[PDB]
Design a protein around this ligand. Sequence first.
Ligand SMILES: O=C(O)[C@H]1CN(c2ncnc3[nH]c4cc(F)ccc4c23)CCC12CCC2
Length: 167
Amino acid sequence: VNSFSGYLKLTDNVYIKNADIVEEAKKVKPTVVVNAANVYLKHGGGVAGALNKATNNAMQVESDDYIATNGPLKVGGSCVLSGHNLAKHCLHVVGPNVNKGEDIQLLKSAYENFNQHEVLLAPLLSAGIFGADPIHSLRVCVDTVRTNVYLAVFDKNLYDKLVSSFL
Ligand SMILES: O=C(O)[C@H]1CN(c2ncnc3[nH]c4cc(F)ccc4c23)CCC12CCC2
């Protein structure tokens, strides 16, 4: 039993809710919140900008030190950093950005990072400003992640479309 509430169950291990991931994180304080990161951990907009803003820019300060030490992530890769006031940990995961021409096959590799964590609160990778089809992202999620994932979908219209079209 965990503290996630109001989710629709899609599969044995994937759950979904129309929610603001920032507000959801603030209330649940999950062990892991996933950020829709880029390879530079520049949290300017989308989910990343919202999560970073909610940390009063502490996520960005920590991220800049991480990059200065380690260099950029790989597309499809991840790193674990602090969850600040939102979660114990933040798993920064880089899905491919279609608006940069990145290979969508890397979306499966991106979701594989979730399997290193027993339970996660997450957005749909490569959705939103990353330009991928969220229905495709949900399919890859379900077919790749084996651990327990609670997906927060900000847009109510998209949430309804994702549920109604789910196979
Ligand atoms: O979920 C969606 O409907 C959109 C938007 N996003 C998010 N997903 C969950 N929580 C969110 N909180 C946010 C606060 C913001 F300022 C901006 C975006 C998000 C956000 C990221 C892109 C997507 C996920 C599927 C396409």
